[PDB]
Design a protein around this nucleic acid. Structure first.
Ligand SMILES: [Mg+2]
Ligand SMILES: [Mg+2]
Ligand SMILES: [Mg+2]
Ligand SMILES: [Mg+2]
Ligand SMILES: [Mg+2]
Ligand SMILES: [Mg+2]
Ligand SMILES: [Mg+2]
Ligand SMILES: [Mg+2]
Ligand SMILES: [Mg+2]
Ligand SMILES: [Mg+2]
Ligand SMILES: [Mg+2]
Ligand SMILES: [Mg+2]
Ligand SMILES: [Mg+2]
Ligand SMILES: [Mg+2]
Ligand SMILES: [Mg+2]
Ligand SMILES: [Mg+2]
Ligand SMILES: [Mg+2]
Ligand SMILES: [Mg+2]
Ligand SMILES: [Mg+2]
Ligand SMILES: [Mg+2]
Ligand SMILES: [Mg+2]
Ligand SMILES: [Mg+2]
Ligand SMILES: [Mg+2]
Ligand SMILES: [Mg+2]
Ligand SMILES: [Mg+2]
Ligand SMILES: [Mg+2]
Ligand SMILES: [Mg+2]
Ligand SMILES: [Mg+2]
Ligand SMILES: [Mg+2]
Ligand SMILES: [Mg+2]
Ligand SMILES: [Mg+2]
Ligand SMILES: [Mg+2]
Ligand SMILES: [Mg+2]
Ligand SMILES: [Mg+2]
Ligand SMILES: [Mg+2]
Ligand SMILES: [Mg+2]
Ligand SMILES: [Mg+2]
Ligand SMILES: [Mg+2]
Ligand SMILES: [Mg+2]
Ligand SMILES: [Mg+2]
Ligand SMILES: [Mg+2]
Ligand SMILES: [Mg+2]
Ligand SMILES: [Mg+2]
Ligand SMILES: [Mg+2]
Ligand SMILES: [Mg+2]
Ligand SMILES: [Mg+2]
Ligand SMILES: [Mg+2]
Ligand SMILES: [Mg+2]
Ligand SMILES: [Mg+2]
Ligand SMILES: [Mg+2]
Ligand SMILES: [Mg+2]
Ligand SMILES: [Mg+2]
Ligand SMILES: [Mg+2]
Ligand SMILES: [Mg+2]
Ligand SMILES: [Mg+2]
Ligand SMILES: [Mg+2]
Ligand SMILES: [Mg+2]
Ligand SMILES: [Mg+2]
Ligand SMILES: [Mg+2]
Ligand SMILES: [Mg+2]
Ligand SMILES: [Mg+2]
Ligand SMILES: [Mg+2]
Ligand SMILES: [Mg+2]
Ligand SMILES: [Mg+2]
Ligand SMILES: [Mg+2]
Length: 183
RNA sequence: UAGGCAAAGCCGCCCGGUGGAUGGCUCGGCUCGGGCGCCGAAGAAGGGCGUGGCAAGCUGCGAUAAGCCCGGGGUAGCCGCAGGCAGGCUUAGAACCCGGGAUCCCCGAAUGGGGCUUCCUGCCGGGGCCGAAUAGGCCCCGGCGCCCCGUAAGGGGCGGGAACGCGGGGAAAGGAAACAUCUUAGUACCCGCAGGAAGGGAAGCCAACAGGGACCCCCUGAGUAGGGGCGACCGAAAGGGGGAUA
RNA sequence: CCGUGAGGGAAAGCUGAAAAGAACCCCGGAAGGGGGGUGAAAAGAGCCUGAAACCGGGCGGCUACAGUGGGGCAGGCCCGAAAGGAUGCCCCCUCCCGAAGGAAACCCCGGUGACGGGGGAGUACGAGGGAGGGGGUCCAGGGUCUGCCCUUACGUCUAGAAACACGGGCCGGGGAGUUCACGGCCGUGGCGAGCCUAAGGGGUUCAACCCCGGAGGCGUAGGGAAACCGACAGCCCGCAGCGGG
RNA sequence: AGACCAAUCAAGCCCGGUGAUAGCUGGUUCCCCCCGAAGCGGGUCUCAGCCCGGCCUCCCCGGAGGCGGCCGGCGGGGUAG
RNA sequence: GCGGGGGCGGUGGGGUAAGCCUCCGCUCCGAGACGGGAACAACCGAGACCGGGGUUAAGGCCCCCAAGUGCGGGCUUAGUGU
RNA sequence: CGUGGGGUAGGGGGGCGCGGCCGUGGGGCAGAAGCCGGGCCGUGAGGUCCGGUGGACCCGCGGCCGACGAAGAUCCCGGCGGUAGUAGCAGCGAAGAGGGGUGAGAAGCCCCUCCGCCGGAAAGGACCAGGGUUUCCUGGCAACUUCAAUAGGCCAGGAGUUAG
RNA sequence: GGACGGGGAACGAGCCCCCGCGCCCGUACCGAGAACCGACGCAGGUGCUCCUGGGUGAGAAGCCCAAGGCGGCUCGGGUGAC
RNA sequence: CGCAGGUCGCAGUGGCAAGGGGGACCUGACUGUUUAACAAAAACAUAGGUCCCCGCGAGCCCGUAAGGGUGUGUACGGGGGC
RNA sequence: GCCCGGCGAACCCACCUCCAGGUGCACAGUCCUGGGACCCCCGACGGGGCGAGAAGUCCCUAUGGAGCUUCACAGCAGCCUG
RNA sequence: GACGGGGUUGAUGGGGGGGCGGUGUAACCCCCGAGGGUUUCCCGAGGGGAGAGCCGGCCCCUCCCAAUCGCCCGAGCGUGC
């Protein structure tokens, strides 16, 4: 089945003008989709939020450091009973190192890099403008319990969509922006 | 002081994901009316197993195994559900439909005898094979159930079928605002036995001095007479009108 | 498929007119993704439409010194194309009429006084209803937030429910006075000292419809257990109505 | 030990009678308009039910009187004190 | 519908008493909105079709809170009391 | 005209909606039903229109009939939440490590070395019932294994049980 | 298997050599802390049912080690508060 | 299996393995059995004691019946109580 | 256990609740009058939420059961007798 | 999570040397040893001497190794009373 994006190319350009002050055409937009990935759905949402507004190289470098357990990911929404940690950013103490989710996002970023390159876009000026994860279909399974009862033990898959735009180099951020209160 | 100005969180709309509602559809169901109505030792119904080039299920079929023969209809396509890959069949008339035949494994009333495994095994007669042998052994085919009728030759019963029919055995729950007689009910259910229908049927009748005229079924008589802790409740018959008529 | 067994037993329909069932290029270990195609439409084989709950993203409003939901009034921000008004709405000014109600300054009389009374004055004003002029730009409606005022979840039995009385996590779909017989009564319709046919029969354009069928049922008379017997227009009061004054 | 007789025993399980019965408990689905109660008396194996009256409602007949108040005339009464 | 309940009155009758039991009567709640009583079915006021204007009822008028730090006399020293 | 306007149970009177039928009048591929949002009308049940989506049926009016209206029944069936990236994946006296290979990818698959546990046995040898292909070979990783996987009692294809 | 009897033939063995025949069904694998039953790849139950070397020791006890098997009673790492 | 001598340790059945003991009362004699899943007991049973029905075509018990159990038995026996 | 990586449920859930003293179907998160609180997150606990679990087994009621008893009302076998 | 110290302009952890401490005297060598035998050059539990040996989640000294390379946050402007 085909999966649609929450945002069409026409509104992606409109969003780019609203956030960067520049006008671009749908020819400067690259997309990729990773349907039904077997990974944590809550941590996928946190990753998509964090890498939005990064350049593609910035997101790749950070995620490659999550895999090595050298940089964490902030957990803003799914934080009940999650411990605090020292963080490289400012304004939020709840952090995780989702290795499995990071590896899948790196494959999606690899597909997105190719899709932009195939269009002739300059990858150094590619900026992630929209990222979203969705709970996909469930793969049902049961866990036998005590007293003759069985309870659900499900694999909830994740649909990840990503859209990036090629911006003029004079408006592209050159460093990480890591004030999470202001972000 | 308020704005630029933002945490986590809240509300609303749009888009997406999830979900499968709604709407439309319908080769399915249900109800009613009409027809038609038995199958089985000539081995049934039911079941098991097998059967397709690639085939698991369903459907069909039975080692001749989605099929064989003859005839009629039907003419050019065909190889079931089932839209694939091959290879074939068919104008010397197929597929398909209808009638008649052939084949029809094992179990099954199952019937030579067993059967704790739908498989095993005996005797007799005939045949084949191994074998030097005519011995011995092995294999194939046929007969071999019980109870009966008949002098015998021979013949009969058995099992099945959605409901309906005939004979017998035969409750309780509930109701009676408790409950026992009673009712429920000669019901549920059980046992036996038939047919395409069964049962009934040809006055030791009914009536009332006037007369009907075998029987069954329908309408009525009638919730009347009558039965009944005369309570709950139960409940005709003759007569009259019809279906049909022997 | 469940139970040793007697027995018990689900869920599950829909591509398109036509496969035209997605060539080809790039990426991926692969599921697959991007580009590019087919078609009227992706309707993409996880296949019509594709709601809500639910989750993600975007947008609008709020957000860390202020206790929550609902209603009214006033305001902030945002939407306000169509289907509503724009002959609108708002402000100012002027004019007219005006219900119930209705002052004040000031003069006079009283009281220690709060205040009362006569005049001013049924005036100024007053719900609303009419007419005109100047100025402005959207108004209505909607989302959200703030201020002020008001405000004790629902369903239920109960004398008494916000109850520390019980039931519901949410959403969708489903989910409860029916039919026959008999009786009483009502509202109408047909016929009327009569009313209706039942089963059934003939025809049909064949369960409809037309015609036949009066058996029987109820009514026309009651009293009595039964044998048995078996019925009014005479007088008064008087509503309606009619006639007289 | 009223143990155990297939997770079942002061009387198994399966299917049937069977939609057993329940004066008891739960539920009973759209809108507006008119009027508007009762928990009293009597009887009942009656006391968580039901029937006959009181109280509600709707329709019809009938046809001129009626009475939660007061005054007076004529009566009754045996309480407070 | 045949479970009633609150206020007041019959020293009702009973009971140590009871937000107690059992009668008699008016009213109210049940089935009655609203103002006052701090909250509060039945205490006080009062009965609501909808919108608006006005005036009163109970009760209140230092602030919370609309309206008086209202007027004369007297008492209390306990924050009694309100 | 009314010193008319509260109301539970209950009685009485009128209307709205849903599915079909008998009539009548219409709409629809120049877009029906359904669906999302919105304006207008009605006290209200509800009606109607607009924009979007959709792709073939539907509606007004009169009459008639019902398998006819849900917020609730520890209601039924399905779906899906918060809980929550939480509990558990400890306890029953074994456990791993280094190097190499394979592979897209290796703590975990294969080989060696080191370390450990059983040894009258939750563990080695045999084997009944029961199971029925789980056996063996080749290949594989969507699902399955409380984690991983290139492994496997899993999946696909092939094969295998010999008696005086 | 033997003995004790009865009947029959003229041949003929339990010894030696030599010839022939022996049907039908089962046979893989697990046999259990993952192949059985318990909804499960379940610390239970079935089956430890039958068998087991050396040292110590009374011992088929425990402990240690062979033959033989296992690291699959199918999560890993860090920290060293309560 | 014993004797003599030497000698070390906190500890010599050094780990492993492996009884705490005594006095008295109540109670059931004892071993045994029991509420599978809250009771293991003083409850049940028991050997022993005693009573009853019975000479067998009996006594007691099962079956609608045909018939059956005790009984392939016989008072030193079968059945039934305490 | 806690922290990291991986898998990934359930109970329960009208909505969801700072404290005091009142009031009320007499034991209030939601009403009244006060007192406080910058918001969010982690660990822990078990005082409260008349916490969750289970249509109270206690007790009563029903013209409800079951089983058991006998000197209940009846009935049927079995045995004895004509 | 936080907190505190150091971060080359440095003794922050390790290594090395030294101090202090725990245990109890390793190896090698020499002597004694109940007794027995290849007769007294061998066996032999054990005792003595010299040397301790092993070890430190403590202290000092010494740059030998590592405190590196790097990644971020951050006010700046208006308006009214
Ligand atoms: Mg179990
Ligand atoms: Mg997952
Ligand atoms: Mg935020
Ligand atoms: Mg057959
Ligand atoms: Mg046979
Ligand atoms: Mg027959
Ligand atoms: Mg019945
Ligand atoms: Mg009865
Ligand atoms: Mg009874
Ligand atoms: Mg006949
Ligand atoms: Mg006949
Ligand atoms: Mg009868
Ligand atoms: Mg679709
Ligand atoms: Mg507009
Ligand atoms: Mg307009
Ligand atoms: Mg109650
Ligand atoms: Mg009560
Ligand atoms: Mg309530
Ligand atoms: Mg209740
Ligand atoms: Mg609940
Ligand atoms: Mg007992
Ligand atoms: Mg029984
Ligand atoms: Mg019974
Ligand atoms: Mg039953
Ligand atoms: Mg009224
Ligand atoms: Mg009740
Ligand atoms: Mg008088
Ligand atoms: Mg007196
Ligand atoms: Mg009463
Ligand atoms: Mg009273
Ligand atoms: Mg009531
Ligand atoms: Mg008040
Ligand atoms: Mg004031
Ligand atoms: Mg009214
Ligand atoms: Mg109509
Ligand atoms: Mg309701
Ligand atoms: Mg549910
Ligand atoms: Mg959940
Ligand atoms: Mg844990
Ligand atoms: Mg061990
Ligand atoms: Mg392990
Ligand atoms: Mg060992
Ligand atoms: Mg041992
Ligand atoms: Mg073994
Ligand atoms: Mg294998
Ligand atoms: Mg293999
Ligand atoms: Mg397999
Ligand atoms: Mg074998
Ligand atoms: Mg296991
Ligand atoms: Mg070995
Ligand atoms: Mg762990
Ligand atoms: Mg020990
Ligand atoms: Mg004893
Ligand atoms: Mg027990
Ligand atoms: Mg015990
Ligand atoms: Mg005893
Ligand atoms: Mg004695
Ligand atoms: Mg005695
Ligand atoms: Mg974790
Ligand atoms: Mg109180
Ligand atoms: Mg509460
Ligand atoms: Mg906690
Ligand atoms: Mg109860
Ligand atoms: Mg109960
Ligand atoms: Mg009673």
């Amino acid at each position: 089945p085909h999966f649609h994006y929450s945002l069409t190319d026409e509104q992606a350009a409109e969003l780019v003008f609203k956030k960067y002050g520049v006008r671009i055409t749908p020819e400067q937009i690259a997309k990729a989709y990773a349907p039904e990935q077997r990974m944590s759905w809550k941590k996928s949402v946190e990753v998509a939020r964090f890498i939005k507004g990064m350049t593609l190289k910035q997101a790749k470098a950070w995620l490659e450091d999550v895999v090595k357990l050298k940089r964490p990911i902030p957990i803003k929404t799914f934080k009940k009973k999650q411990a605090h940690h020292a963080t490289p950013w400012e304004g939020w103490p709840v952090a995780k190192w989702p290795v499995k989710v990071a590896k899948r996002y790196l494959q999606l970023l690899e597909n997105l890099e190719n899709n932009a390159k195939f269009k002739g876009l300059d990858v150094e000026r590619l900026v992630i403008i929209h990222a979203a994860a969705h709970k996909g279909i469930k793969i049902p399974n049961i866990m036998p319990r005590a007293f003759g009862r069985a309870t659900p033990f499900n694999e909830e898959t994740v649909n990840v969509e990503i859209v990036a735009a090629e911006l003029p180099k004079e408006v592209v951020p050159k460093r990480y922006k890591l004030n999470l209160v202001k972000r």
